[PDB]
Design a protein around this ligand. Structure first.
Ligand SMILES: [Mg+2]
Ligand SMILES: [Mg+2]
Ligand SMILES: [Mg+2]
Ligand SMILES: [Mg+2]
Ligand SMILES: [Mg+2]
Ligand SMILES: [Mg+2]
Ligand SMILES: [Mg+2]
Ligand SMILES: [Mg+2]
Ligand SMILES: [Mg+2]
Ligand SMILES: [Mg+2]
Ligand SMILES: [Mg+2]
Ligand SMILES: [Mg+2]
Ligand SMILES: [Mg+2]
Ligand SMILES: [Mg+2]
Ligand SMILES: [Mg+2]
Ligand SMILES: [Mg+2]
Ligand SMILES: [Mg+2]
Ligand SMILES: [Mg+2]
Ligand SMILES: [Mg+2]
Ligand SMILES: [Mg+2]
Ligand SMILES: [Mg+2]
Ligand SMILES: [Mg+2]
Ligand SMILES: [Mg+2]
Ligand SMILES: [Mg+2]
Ligand SMILES: [Mg+2]
Ligand SMILES: [Mg+2]
Ligand SMILES: [Mg+2]
Ligand SMILES: [Mg+2]
Ligand SMILES: [Mg+2]
Ligand SMILES: [Mg+2]
Ligand SMILES: [Mg+2]
Ligand SMILES: [Mg+2]
Ligand SMILES: [Mg+2]
Ligand SMILES: [Mg+2]
Ligand SMILES: [Mg+2]
Ligand SMILES: [Mg+2]
Ligand SMILES: [Mg+2]
Lengths: 60, 67, 144, 185
RNA sequence: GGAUAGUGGCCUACCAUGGUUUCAACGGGUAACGGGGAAUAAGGGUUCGAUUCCGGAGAGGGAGCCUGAGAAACGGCUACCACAUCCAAGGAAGGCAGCAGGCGCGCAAAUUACCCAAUCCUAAUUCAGGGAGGUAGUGACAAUAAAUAACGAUACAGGGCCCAUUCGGGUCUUGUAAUUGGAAUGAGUACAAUGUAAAUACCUUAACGAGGAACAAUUGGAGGGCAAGUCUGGUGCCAGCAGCCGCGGUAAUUCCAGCUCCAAUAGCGUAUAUUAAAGUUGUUGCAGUUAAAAAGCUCGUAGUUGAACUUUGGGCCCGGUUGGCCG
RNA sequence: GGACUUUUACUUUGAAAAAAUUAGAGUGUUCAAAGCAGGCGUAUUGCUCGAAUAUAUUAGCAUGGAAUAAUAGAAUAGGACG
């Protein structure tokens, strides 16, 4: 195959995606408290059983 | 606090059977300080190049100033 | 019994046959011929640092259709020339021929990776500053 | 030229990395007994697997064998002494059948909670580590301690460290430095 | 016979023609010091050991030798070869695979620091000396323990549940809450004592030291294998992804981001190797009609293998170790 | 002490046997990796448990066994006992 194809576009999309800066957000509990936060979220007060248990449903 | 102790039959008995750094910690021996370890070694090695007393070599090196 | 001598004193025949048939084992063959030392641009090592000659637009294989950004590298310990990939969109702006990159295996036991034809190596660092770091923003490329 | 300081690792790691059923049952243990790692569960399963292994290797021998009796009773008596093995099922065909929660049950994490004193598995965590409750006068800050079935009667708050009564402490005594400084002179 | 401390083709003289080998001699290779051991966990195996102990070999490469109980010594000498230094040009001097440190080489590895206090060693010796060794520095090699929060109050709301003719919220807490509440502790800092040869840290412990601006956890992934979105924006077979299968050519469940989510977590990715998965090296344990594989055929030496039969059967005695019904 | 003995393989037990490593006992390094400690008293002039056990496989040595599998013997009798 060809080897000397163009290089002008090196970085095209990364350099033209609009930068939407991150958003400041509540600090997450780093440690056992997170495993606890997973426990009560997953098993204690379970949110929905709409057929099955969705773990990241946006527009359901 | 769990430690270890010695009690000697006399104070003379201690100042000979005791480590010389413990008598420093107490006061029963003045810390006679000397030049650094790697200074004494260099002194020894410098000393090893002179066969004899040496001050006889100071006379012949006084002849150097003439020539 | 189909072949293998079941006799109680046939150990030599059984050892030697194994010895002989190990050679059909692809890995056993390379390990004893020292192929990594003989062949294989890297001297048998995990990485190898080299120097960039020219920047190549290797065109991907089918059914893909792209231009995969790569650099021809002349390994220091070897002088062997090797064309290696520069991953991660961008990153061909970091290399700048005559530079000193650190190559690494591509993770297919030789065997060029994907649609990239005949590229068995990828860049990990340039100018000693960690391609990944340059990509994000963590480090900056050195003076020259 | 020194005798090599020996070491060993205290945990194993599961082969299937994303077995969802296994992950479920793990979080439950971490959430019940207040752990922070899967390694805190991996460790116990590692310790438990070797214990079974000795038991397995011993059963294959003939009953009342010298090694089997000597080392078998030791294993039984040790597990009993820390309170993991029941008094009746005390002949090592049950130590083969031991499960993870039995070991988790003896951690100073849990006895400190089971016997009041924390009202929460996680309050137990923070109390233990923070120079609070002891065994004798011997303070202990390791949530995994294996309360040994007879040191169970000695899990009280520390002689230091309020909640056992020695002093308020810097955070509380600071308020006593603003109640007597703003109100008085 | 000579030589050695001594055996011996160790060497010499004389004589003889022997010595090894398909049960692989001889030769080649080794990215080869051997071993205790290391990694991988059904077993059988596979792979590795330069390197904490033991043995051997070496001191830039060869050879030679002095001293001596012991060296073919190298921090001893002599010579040559290769290095390489100083000079007044006449000459003289060096051997870090000791401890540090430097250059080179590379993917790849730390201080030109302190002490003989310990462990031991040497001497004429209780003392001196010891870069042996110990101390500290550098140090995410590997290994252990396991902080980044814990508990109330209250504001709607929900599920319990007694009643339900019908207002509902009442006291059992499930917790999501954009106001609150006093509690706790070392990370750090630091009198002091402790530690230490002297210091440093650790273990102790005055005075300080937590509310989101923090004392603010990361590293990968979120189509399948594979745990976690068919969300919004961007690009438009480009840029890039993608171990493997495959994504991207204008509504992208794979790219570039935001959001949210998963996994492991003071750790996590990648590369290379190796082991398991591999009964894809198969002794245990493979396959060979057609998928890879029975020599065209027969003889046949080495090798492996090889029918059945030769004191069986009956009798007496001694004393052991479990287990029973009993104590 | 004298006089002689067909050869072997296998299996049993045992001696000979470094430590660290491994497996493993005892012991609450605050836990644990470790370590080989330590535990008791009259804690004002000592009492005292330890520092196990196992594997150590080919060869060599020692011993019990005599199935399995080899070897040798008396045929031109140049046989066997006395
Ligand atoms: Mg000196
Ligand atoms: Mg072939
Ligand atoms: Mg080219
Ligand atoms: Mg001769
Ligand atoms: Mg001849
Ligand atoms: Mg052969
Ligand atoms: Mg070599
Ligand atoms: Mg080797
Ligand atoms: Mg294999
Ligand atoms: Mg070795
Ligand atoms: Mg080497
Ligand atoms: Mg030598
Ligand atoms: Mg050298
Ligand atoms: Mg020499
Ligand atoms: Mg030297
Ligand atoms: Mg020497
Ligand atoms: Mg050096
Ligand atoms: Mg390194
Ligand atoms: Mg030193
Ligand atoms: Mg932090
Ligand atoms: Mg804060
Ligand atoms: Mg992230
Ligand atoms: Mg995404
Ligand atoms: Mg899934
Ligand atoms: Mg394809
Ligand atoms: Mg659009
Ligand atoms: Mg769109
Ligand atoms: Mg989209
Ligand atoms: Mg991992
Ligand atoms: Mg078999
Ligand atoms: Mg097959
Ligand atoms: Mg065909
Ligand atoms: Mg065929
Ligand atoms: Mg045929
Ligand atoms: Mg033929
Ligand atoms: Mg037969
Ligand atoms: Mg034996």
């Amino acid at each position: 195959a060809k080897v000397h194809g163009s290089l002008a576009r090196a970085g095209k999309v990364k350099s033209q995606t609009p930068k939407v800066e991150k958003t400041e957000k509540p600090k997450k509990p780093k440690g056992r408290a997170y495993k606890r936060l997973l426990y009560t979220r997953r098993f204690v007060n379970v949110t929905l059983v709409n057929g099955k248990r969705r773990m990241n449903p946006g527009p359901s | 606090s769990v430690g270890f102790g010695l009690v000697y039959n006399s104070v003379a008995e201690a100042k000979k059977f005791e480590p010389t750094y413990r008598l420093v910690r107490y006061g029963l021996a003045e810390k006679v300080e000397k030049a650094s370890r790697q200074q004494r070694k260099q002194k020894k090695n410098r000393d090893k190049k002179i066969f004899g007393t040496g001050k006889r070599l100071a006379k012949k090196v006084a002849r150097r100033n003439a020539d | 019994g189909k072949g293998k001598p079941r006799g109680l004193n046939s150990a030599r025949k059984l050892r030697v046959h194994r010895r002989n048939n190990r050679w059909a084992e692809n890995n056993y063959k390379k390990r004893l011929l020292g192929t990594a030392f003989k062949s294989s641009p890297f001297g048998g090592s995990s990485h190898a640092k080299g120097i960039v000659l020219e920047k190549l637009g290797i065109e991907s294989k089918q059914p893909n259709s792209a231009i995969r950004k790569c650099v021809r590298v002349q390994l220091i310990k070897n002088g062997k020339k090797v064309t290696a990939f520069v991953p991660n969109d961008g990153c061909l702006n970091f290399v700048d021929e005559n530079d000193e990159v650190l190559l690494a295996g591509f993770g297919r036991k030789g065997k060029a990776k994907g649609d990239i034809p005949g590229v068995r190596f990828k860049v990990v660092k340039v100018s000693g500053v960690s391609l990944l770091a340059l990509w994000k923003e963590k480090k900056e490329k050195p003076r020259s | 030229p020194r005798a090599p300081r020996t070491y060993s690792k205290t945990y194993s790691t599961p082969k299937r990395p994303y077995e969802s059923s296994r992950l479920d049952a793990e979080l439950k243990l971490a959430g019940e007994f207040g752990l922070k790692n899967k390694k805190e569960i991996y460790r116990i399963s590692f310790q438990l697997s070797k214990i079974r292994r000795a038991a397995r290797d011993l059963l294959t021998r003939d009953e009342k064998d010298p090694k089997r009796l000597f080392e078998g009773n030791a294993l039984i008596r040790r597990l009993v002494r820390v309170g993991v093995l029941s008094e009746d099922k005390k002949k090592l065909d049950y130590v083969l059948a031991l499960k993870v929660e039995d070991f988790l049950e003896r951690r100073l994490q849990t006895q400190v909670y089971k016997l009041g004193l924390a009202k929460s598995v996680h309050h137990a965590r923070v109390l233990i580590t923070q120079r609070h409750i002891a065994v004798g006068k011997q303070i202990v800050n390791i949530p995994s301690f294996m309360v040994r079935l007879d040191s169970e009667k000695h899990i009280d708050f520390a002689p230091t460290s309020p909640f056992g009564g020695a002093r308020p402490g810097r955070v509380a005594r600071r308020n006593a430095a603003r109640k007597a400084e703003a109100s008085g002179e």
